[PDB]
Design a protein around this ligand. Structure first.
Ligand SMILES: [C][C][C][C][C][C][C][C][C][C][C][C][C][C][C]C(=O)O[C][C]([C]OP(=O)([O-])O[C][C][N+]([C])([C])[C][O-][P@@](=O)(O[C][C][N+]([C])([C])[C])O[C][C]([C]OC(=O)[C][C][C][C][C][C][C][C][C][C][C][C][C][C][C])OC(=O)[C][C][C][C][C][C][C]/[C]=[C]\[C][C][C][C][C][C][C][C])OC(=O)[C][C][C][C][C][C][C]/[C]=[C]\[C][C][C][C][C][C][C][C]
Ligand SMILES: CCCCCCCC/C=C\CCCCCCCC(=O)O[C@@H](COC(=O)CCCCCCCCCCCCCCC)COP(=O)([O-])OCC[N+](C)(C)C
Ligand SMILES: CCCCCCCC/C=C\CCCCCCCC(=O)O[C@@H](COC(=O)CCCCCCCCCCCCCCC)COP(=O)([O-])OCC[N+](C)(C)C
Ligand SMILES: CCCCCCCC/C=C\CCCCCCCC(=O)O[C@@H](COC(=O)CCCCCCCCCCCCCCC)COP(=O)([O-])OCC[N+](C)(C)C
Ligand SMILES: CCCCCCCC/C=C\CCCCCCCC(=O)O[C@@H](COC(=O)CCCCCCCCCCCCCCC)COP(=O)([O-])OCC[N+](C)(C)C
Ligand SMILES: CCCCCCCC/C=C\CCCCCCCC(=O)O[C@@H](COC(=O)CCCCCCCCCCCCCCC)COP(=O)([O-])OCC[N+](C)(C)C
Ligand SMILES: CCCCCCCC/C=C\CCCCCCCC(=O)O[C@@H](COC(=O)CCCCCCCCCCCCCCC)COP(=O)([O-])OCC[N+](C)(C)C
Ligand code: BEF
Lengths: 768, 153
């Protein structure tokens, strides 16, 4: 696969295709210097792309079952590879399930945890004949299951992920889109020079030499190399903040995203049950009432029920784990039952005080003794009204009580619990709303339990069932999903469709997921985000995996994601103008004059425009508070003008050399050398205007970029002085004339770009 | 064309004649400008597009046949011409015909005596330039909502 994914990188994208057209043309012309550079630089685009994809691919691979069966009537243990579907398997407590199964016959009912794949943090009591899902963990009981199919939400995940990944990316779309348009401008100026090269009868070798020189500059040879390098170097900063990208295009899409979809279970919540204390009943000991609950629980791994484990570390007392058993001397314990739904414990107290403490469902705790409390029907209504508040609050409800040895119960009260969101996810949402993107939540849990997490997070509490209005198989649908604050009870194929609506309306969408349910959606998503607790199908399908616990790393990731865009936005505005420069300038030079800057000097301009902007990746950039735009019609119009202003400036300089006595030549100079000196200085410094918001002096250039250009300007200066690949020599006095004149053109460019970039009108005029 | 692969529209088809005529108005003129650029090069002394020796009738018939034949590739594709790969029957038909067009001018059949190979490859590469121009116009006509309105009214 590695050789296949590498060689498609050479092909894909219109910029790259014409390079083989350039490479064969230069090879056919026996100009092996031009053959080496583009073919050498084409490998560099792969070199940045392949090494990162291999290295980051190594990290996610570092992140990446046996069963008891009855075969021919005798019981053996076999791994999960050779189970043949449509056959009865015996699975017991605590196991991880290979495949889906139908429960055959059970006298007591199973409880398995569905948090891992489909996200339900409450263990579901499961009946005979029920649909069971793979990879779950059994928390209660014994059972026989007949399996349905081999790997199937795992099989559903793999099929949909393979179905997805079409539409290479938002970046590659605009990256191809610029590549097409520039190729049209290459054809537009090639026809102008081919018309002229026919009228003056020219040998085919001369015409192709002009054709070779234009196509090197017209389609940017370094743009696939630079822009991938710019996002790859930025991606290294992500790896230094514990965030790994798999395919690079997501990082710019993470800048351009303005809807974040979230899964409640793994991404938002700690998937460990916990209790809210301020939401407890009028019991006299608010804190001691949960201490009663820990008394009624098992203490070792046989009876560590999922809810019972939540109580043990819920205490604020420093010995929370040990405080439930400080010399209480448990005599006997009642295990949890399907029908009585209770756990009660007998403990011994000083002076021979046999006291008993219980846990259970609120209805079954309340009916231990009907008359034990005063006003028995009112305390009935008092908790049941509170449970009615509690059920509308989405909290799972558990009642506790206490009895004396002789057998009179005293009902302490009812206590709630749920899966709570992380501490940072309250804020990580909050400045995500500051950072310009609306957030939504997509979960397979119930609506009411998801409503609770909405107002805790402050989302808006406007969520809807997936099944009832998410389409089974629309513009009115588009309005609803966009206006929906979130969707609950969602299935994997609905989560993909929630994205499908938003992509069609034009939104860029990123979503966070751990389970295999939204792993199909992760591949579809513009930015696939995984968390520290992500499943293997998620981490394979996610474009970005978070190594750190919590979701707080996205704000770190998003801020530098927008910085990479402005680093790329500055370069792509810059690099199109250079092509549009030399397309006009060489196109007119060949048309009017049938001369051009020599083919050896043309390729050096392509390198120098490239290598100076290789340091763009290390340039400092500001992040926009709003989601970024990639406003292509303005980008093209701003690069239309700056290339012409360059084109006028180079045409002023060139025609001075036509005059007798030199014009711009003061003592002696080379007509090719001076213009290459002129062009390189004018092209290279164009990066300084574009890199800065508004005026070019607003932000100080980074030493990497500034050093890169200034070194390249020196190498540009040496070439014309000693006259390499050109006419013999140019004196220093002519050179300083070109430098000071190029500073004049540079200051002109600052005026135009500033008057374009901050102007509200030019954006409107170029859009329409 | 009969054996060429084609996509079916989800809506009922249109046969929108005013747009069909207007789109063919332009593409013929773009061909007409292109052939007139090529022909007047041959008026110049030293040949213009003739590099060693050529036939004024032969080169234009070489020019016209190449420019006319490949026009089917733009029109057969919805939007850009590279969107759908041509069928081997159509692509083989045109490329064979382009070869038969090429042999006629080289050996100068029914025309002036001979045209060398170097002039011929000049006409071929120039015709590719006209072809890429045609892809721009037809794409900018066919998917544009405005041109349909302007030609209808
Ligand atoms: C919109 C549309 C637009 C349209 C435009 C139109 C244009 C028109 C033009 C026409 C012109 C004609 C020319 C005439 C001249 C003649 O003919 O001649 C005469 C003379 C003498 O004769 P002879 O006898 O032949 O003599 C001989 C000599 N010899 C021997 C040859 C020599 O040599 P060499 O080689 O060397 C160099 C020289 N010097 C001196 C220069 C140095 O050379 C050669 C020459 C000759 O050849 C020729 O002929 C040339 C021709 C050229 C033509 C080209 C055309 C262009 C076209 C383009 C188009 C574009 C399209 C696009 C659109 C879409 O030699 C000599 O010397 C000659 C002189 C010079 C001539 C030329 C001048 C220039 C031309 C043209 C330019 C213009 C361009 C425009 C652009 C546009 C943009 C769009 O006698 C005499 O003296 C002559 C004088 C006369 C002058 C004329 C002037 C011009 C007029 C007008 C201009 C234009 C205006 C318009 C504007 C527009 C607005 C919009
Ligand atoms: C707003 C739009 C306007 C456009 C700007 C208009 C500027 C043009 C305005 C003026 C230029 C004319 C200068 C007069 C020169 C007279 C002296 C002379 O040498 O004549 C020459 C002919 O002269 C020509 O043939 C000119 C043809 C160029 C027309 C190009 C327009 C295309 C516009 C598309 C825009 C391009 C954009 C590219 C696409 C991206 C003599 O012929 P020669 O023998 O070959 O020369 C000597 C050869 N030798 C030295 C080897 C011996
Ligand atoms: C915006 C306009 C700015 C430019 C205005 C230009 C005004 C200045 C024009 C001329 C200055 C004076 C030159 C002649 C004076 C001396 C006579 C002579 O020596 O013959 C010359 C004839 O060569 C020419 O005729 C040059 C023609 C200039 C065309 C400029 C194209 C402008 C297109 C711009 C469109 C860009 C915008 C793009 C928008 C799409 C010599 O030619 P040579 O063979 O090269 O040299 C021989 C050596 N020797 C001379 C040392 C002996
Ligand atoms: C806003 C745009 C601004 C435009 C400003 C226009 C600037 C135009 C202003 C001046 C241009 C002409 C200056 C005259 C200088 C001539 C000097 C002379 O002696 O005659 C020369 C002849 O000259 C030629 O051979 C032809 C040169 C003139 C063509 C210039 C076309 C400019 C195109 C404009 C493109 C604009 C398109 C832009 C569209 C966007 C001498 O040649 P000779 O007699 O054969 O022998 C010489 C012997 N000697 C070498 C020893 C001397
Ligand atoms: C889309 C529609 C666009 C509008 C169309 C209008 C286009 C205008 C059409 C024709 C204009 C040119 C006709 C003038 C011919 C002059 C004759 C002559 O004497 O040659 C003179 C040169 O002069 C030139 O060759 C300049 C030609 C440059 C034309 C640039 C515009 C092409 C537009 C591209 C669009 C085309 C594709 C369009 C679609 C396919 C001198 O030649 P010579 O003395 O023998 O040699 C000198 C000696 N030497 C060799 C040592 C130097
Ligand atoms: C878009 C425009 C592009 C075309 C611009 C054309 C500019 C170029 C024009 C001329 C280039 C220079 C030619 C003369 C130079 C040399 C002098 C000479 O030899 O005499 C010539 C006189 O023949 C002519 O005068 C040619 C006339 C050209 C008319 C072009 C029509 C354009 C219509 C386009 C409308 C299409 C749009 C349709 C939309 C409805 C020789 O004539 P000959 O008898 O044939 O040959 C004798 C042999 N010999 C020459 C070898 C000796
Ligand atoms: C956007 C449109 C762009 C249009 C661009 C316009 C391009 C025009 C540019 C240049 C045209 C002229 C170039 C001059 C070259 C001649 C040089 C010469 O020596 O004189 C010649 C005379 O020339 C003739 O005999 C007549 C040729 C000129 C007529 C050209 C009409 C173009 C129509 C345009 C239609 C446009 C309609 C388009 C409407 C859609 C020499 O002839 P001779 O002296 O008798 O002897 C020759 C001896 N010899 C053979 C040994 C040499
Ligand atoms: F387990 Be879920 F996808 F957060």
């Amino acid at each position: 696969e590695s050789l296949v994914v590498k060689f498609v990188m050479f092909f894909v994208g219109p910029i790259q295709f014409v390079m083989e057209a350039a490479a064969i043309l230069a090879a056919g012309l026996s100009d092996w210097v031009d053959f080496g550079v583009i073919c050498g630089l084409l490998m560099l685009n792969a070199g940045v792309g392949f090494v990162q994809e291999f290295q980051a691919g190594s990290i996610v691979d570092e992140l990446k079952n046996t069963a008891v069966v009855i075969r021919d009537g005798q019981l053996v243990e076999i791994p999960a590879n050779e189970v043949v579907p449509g056959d009865i398997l015996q699975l017991e407590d605590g196991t991880v399930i290979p495949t889906d199964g139908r429960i055959v016959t059970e006298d007591c009912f199973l409880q398995i945890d569905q948090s891992a794949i489909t996200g339900e943090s409450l263990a579901v009591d499961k009946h005979y004949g029920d649909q069971t899902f793979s990879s779950s963990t059994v928390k209660r009981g014994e059972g026989f299951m007949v399996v349905t199919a081999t790997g199937t939400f795992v099989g559903r995940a793999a099929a949909l992920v393979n179905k997805a990944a079409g539409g290479q990316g938002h970046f590659t779309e605009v990256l191809n889109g610029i590549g097409i348009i520039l190729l049209v401008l290459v054809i537009a100026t090639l026809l102008l020079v081919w018309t002229a090269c026919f009228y003056r009868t020219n040998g085919i070798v001369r015409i192709l030499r002009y054709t070779l020189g234009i196509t090197i500059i017209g389609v940017p040879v370094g743009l696939p190399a630079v822009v991938t390098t710019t996002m790859a170097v930025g991606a290294a900063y992500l790896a230094k903040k514990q965030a790994i990208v798999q395919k690079l295009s997501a990082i710019e899409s993470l800048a351009g995203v303005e809807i974040l979809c979230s899964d409640k279970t793994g991404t938002l919540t700690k998937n460990k049950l916990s209790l809210h204390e301020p939401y407890t009943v009028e019991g006299v000991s608010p804190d001691d009432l949960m201490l009663t609950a820990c008394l009624a629980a098992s203490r070792k791994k046989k009876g560590l029920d999922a809810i019972d484990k939540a109580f043990l570390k819920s205490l604020k007392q420093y010995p929370k784990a040990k405080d439930a058993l400080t010399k209480y001397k448990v005599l006997e314990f009642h295990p949890f039952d399907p029908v009585s739904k209770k756990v009660t414990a007998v403990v011994e107290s000083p002076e021979g005080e046999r006291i008993v403490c219980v846990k259970g469902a609120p209805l079954f705790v309340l009916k231990t003794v009907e008359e034990d409390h005063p006003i028995p029907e009112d305390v009935h209504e008092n908790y049941e009204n509170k449970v009615a508040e509690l059920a509308s609050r989405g909290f799972r409800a558990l009642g506790v009580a206490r009895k004396r040895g002789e057998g009179h119960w005293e009902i302490l009260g009812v206590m709630p619990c749920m899966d709570p969101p992380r501490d940072d996810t309250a804020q990580t949402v909050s400045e995500a709303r500051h950072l310009g993107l609306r957030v939504k939540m997509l979960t397979g849990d119930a609506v009411g339990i998801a409503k609770e997490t909405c107002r805790q997070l402050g989302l808006g509490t406007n969520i809807y069932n997936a099944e009832r209005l998410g389409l089974g198989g629309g513009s009115e649908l588009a309005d609803f999903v966009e206006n929906a604050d979130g969707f609950a009870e969602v299935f994997p194929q609905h989560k993909y469709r929630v994205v499908e609506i938003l992509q069609n309306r034009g939104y860029l969408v990123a979503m966070t997921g751990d389970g295999v349910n939204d792993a199909p959606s992760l591949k579809k998503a513009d930015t696939g985000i995984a968390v520290e607790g992500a499943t293997d199908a998620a981490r394979s399908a996610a474009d970005i995996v978070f190594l750190a616990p919590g979701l707080s790393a996205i704000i770190d990731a998003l801020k530098t994601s927008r910085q990479i865009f402005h680093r790329m936005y500055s370069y792509v505005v810059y690099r199109i103008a250079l092509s549009l420069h030399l397309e006009i300038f060489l196109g007119l030079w060949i048309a009017i004059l049938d001369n051009s800057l020599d083919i050896d000097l043309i390729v050096f301009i392509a390198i120098f425009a490239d290598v100076a902007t290789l340091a763009i990746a290390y340039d400092n950039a500001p992040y926009s508070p709003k989601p970024v735009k990639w406003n292509l019609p303005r980008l093209w119009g701003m690069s239309i003008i700056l290339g012409i202003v360059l084109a006028i400036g180079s045409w002023i300089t060139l025609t001075t050399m036509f005059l007798p006595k030199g014009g711009i030549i003061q003592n002696f100079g080379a007509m090719n050398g001076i213009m290459f000196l002129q062009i390189s200085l004018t092209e290279n410094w164009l990066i300084f205007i574009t890199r800065a918001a508004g005026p070019f002096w607003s932000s100080i250039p980074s030493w990497q970029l500034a050093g890169a250009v200034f070194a390249v300007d020196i190498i540009a200066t040496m070439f014309t002085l000693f006259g390499w690949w050109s006419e013999n020599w140019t004196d220093i006095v002519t050179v300083v004339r070109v430098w000071i004149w190029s500073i004049g053109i540079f200051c002109v460019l600052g005026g135009f770009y500033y008057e374009m970039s901050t102007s509200e009108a030019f954006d409107r005029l170029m859009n329409g």
